Amino acid sequence: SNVITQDLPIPVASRGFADIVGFGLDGVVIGRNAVNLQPFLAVKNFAQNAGGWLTTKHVRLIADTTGTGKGDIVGFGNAGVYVSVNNGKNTFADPPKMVIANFGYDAGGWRVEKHLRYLADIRKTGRADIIGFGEKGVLVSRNNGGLNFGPATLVLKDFGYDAGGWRLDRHLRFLADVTGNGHLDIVGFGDKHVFISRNNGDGTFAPAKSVIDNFCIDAGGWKIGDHPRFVADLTGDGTADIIGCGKAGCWVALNNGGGVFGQVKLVINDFGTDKGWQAAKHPRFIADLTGNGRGDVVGFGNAGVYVALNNGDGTFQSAKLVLKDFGVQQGWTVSKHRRFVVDLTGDGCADIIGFGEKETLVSYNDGKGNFGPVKALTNDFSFSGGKWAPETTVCWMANLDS
Ligand SMILES: CC(=O)N[C@@H]1[C@@H](O)[C@H](O[C@@H]2O[C@H](CO)[C@H](O)[C@H](O[C@@H]3O[C@H](CO)[C@@H](O)[C@H](O)[C@H]3NC(C)=O)[C@H]2O)[C@@H](CO)O[C@H]1O
Ligand SMILES: CC(=O)N[C@@H]1[C@@H](O)[C@H](O[C@@H]2O[C@H](CO)[C@H](O)[C@H](O[C@@H]3O[C@H](CO)[C@@H](O)[C@H](O)[C@H]3NC(C)=O)[C@H]2O)[C@@H](CO)O[C@H]1O
Ligand SMILES: CC(=O)N[C@@H]1[C@@H](O)[C@H](O[C@@H]2O[C@H](CO)[C@H](O)[C@H](O[C@@H]3O[C@H](CO)[C@@H](O)[C@H](O)[C@H]3NC(C)=O)[C@H]2O)[C@@H](CO)O[C@H]1O
Ligand SMILES: CC(=O)N[C@@H]1[C@@H](O)[C@H](O[C@@H]2O[C@H](CO)[C@H](O)[C@H](O[C@@H]3O[C@H](CO)[C@@H](O)[C@H](O)[C@H]3NC(C)=O)[C@H]2O)[C@@H](CO)O[C@H]1O
Ligand SMILES: CC(=O)N[C@@H]1[C@@H](O)[C@H](O[C@@H]2O[C@H](CO)[C@H](O)[C@H](O[C@@H]3O[C@H](CO)[C@@H](O)[C@H](O)[C@H]3NC(C)=O)[C@H]2O)[C@@H](CO)O[C@H]1O
Ligand SMILES: CC(=O)N[C@H]1[C@H](O[C@@H]2[C@@H](O)[C@H](O)O[C@H](CO)[C@@H]2O)O[C@H](CO)[C@@H](O)[C@@H]1O
């Protein structure tokens, strides 16, 4: 189940060779997954010191906007959305083209503090539409090919800042197939209910439906940051289940099809605030560590990397330390360093990659959820005196080849 969340707006293939994309100070640096990693400056734009880009005002992502199966550089900037197409041959277009005068800080009054902006193929046509949770609800710009985007259209008066009272500090809004039709639907962790809105197929979304009375700020006491929540396929049927890291551990509600969810159950007695897990220090992720199509729980704790394996049915084995690195004890801080759990080897078993203090480090999956010795991939993409500070730079893992 390919999903889109606030922390990871770019879906990464469970089986593939994830590339490094770094919106750095001077422009976009590409670290193509290859035998000899050689990061290069591809576009002199989308940057703090090239185009005047700011993490506080702008959004920078990767998506296939043309339908060639190549990942393009996309930037929600001031006057609109800019796209540097992947021209193949390891080159990106420079300068980019502005494909639409909306979804911008100036053009549209879009705010990182209030609104969300995603790129998703919600029509399943092979290229990414623009989907934004704005002021009055959900706005969609349909991708008509050739970088021609239709006007931003309000397709659902909900999940908005001024449409249902949605807040970044209280609520969560993801895209995921929860019905089982292969089409991304809207999933919203509101105040008292987890809601879903069905993808109607025509680029619009059905009125919100309350489906869970849990996983929310006023239903179970789930707080932003402290208790992270995730949409993921935990059974292998392609639908998104729901899993959160609460107080006493991880709670799961299983997708029973059509957006109907089973009862919320405690499946792992770990990864929660009761056992020291904190938002500021201990990032958690759902990834497939065994290549069976089921998401396992991965956590970067104090002493290093802990993993709880999925039994295959949404039930889990107990969490255990699998790596003595990438933790607090090894100098890792959320404020300065990045960490991702993605397949780098094409075996469908997620590997670990950390953008650390002075080097980008890696740990490969043996194919069964065990991890080998840490190797240094490059000196690039590391914090390095603020050369790659998260405040000014944005690092993503992405599949430039789709
Ligand atoms: C009336 C007025 O002066 N308003 C100010 C805005 O103009 C200003 O936005 C900057 O506006 C530029 C056009 O006047 C331009 O759109 C610029 O966007 C940048 O444009 C370049 C060239 O196309 C592009 O390469 C670059 O990527 C792009 N950067 C971003 C982030 O979009 C825009 O920033 C605004 C900010 O200074 O302040 C307003 O007062
Ligand atoms: C800080 C403050 O008090 N100001 C608030 C306004 O920011 C807020 O605004 C805006 O309302 C507009 C209608 O008067 C409009 O809905 C606007 O949204 C935008 O709508 C256009 C289409 O009409 C769309 O193209 C664009 O993408 C969309 N932008 C966003 C971000 O959704 C909206 O910002 C106002 C509520 O109306 O409340 C004020 O207090
Ligand atoms: C008193 C207290 O401690 N609890 C307050 C919450 O009740 C309150 O939440 C609002 O509760 C409503 C109950 O009828 C409702 O669930 C509302 O959620 C909104 O519901 C509509 C459909 O009815 C839906 O379209 C919309 O998307 C949804 N919005 C969200 C964000 O969930 C809910 O906000 C809360 C905020 O007022 O304050 C609590 O203190
Ligand atoms: C130090 C101490 O003992 N403090 C007590 C708290 O631990 C306790 O909080 C709650 O503990 C519950 C188990 O005893 C449980 O973990 C609960 O989490 C919530 O549990 C419900 C199901 O019971 C679940 O639906 C919900 O999703 C889940 N929420 C989260 C975010 O995990 C937890 O709040 C407190 C109240 O019982 O009492 C303290 O004395
Ligand atoms: C000017 C100065 O003295 N700065 C100090 C920082 O350098 C220091 O950070 C640590 O920097 C080290 C420089 O060699 C090193 O990069 C270290 O990174 C850790 O390296 C180990 C061994 O390869 C690796 O296993 C681990 O994963 C890795 N951790 C990270 C986050 O990359 C880094 O912690 C800082 C903390 O002591 O203090 C500064 O004063
Ligand atoms: C967040 C985390 O890693 N918690 C795990 C736990 O915690 C560490 C301890 O290993 C260490 O001794 O103290 C630090 C605080 O200074 C953390 O609390 O270790 C548990 C297993 O022993 C594990 O279940 C927790 O998830």
Residue numbers in the entry: 3 to 404
Publication passage describing the model:
In this paper, we report the crystal structures of a lectin from Agrocybe aegerita, designated as AAL2, in its apo- and complex forms with GlcNAc and GlcNAcβ1-3Galβ1-4GlcNAc, as part of our endeavors to develop a system to facilitate the identification and purification of O-GlcNAcylated proteins. AAL2 was recently discovered from the fruit body of the edible mushroom A. aegerita. AAL2 was found to specifically bind nonreducing terminal N-acetylglucosamine (GlcNAc) moieties of either alpha- or beta-linkage and was reported to have the activity of inducing apoptosis in hepatoma cells in vitro as well as inhibiting hepatoma growth in tumour-bearing mice in vivo. The overall structure of AAL2 monomer is a single domain with the shape of cylindrical torus with a diameter of about 51Å and a height of about 27Å, showing a very regular, seven-bladed β-propeller fold formed by the blades packing in a circular array.
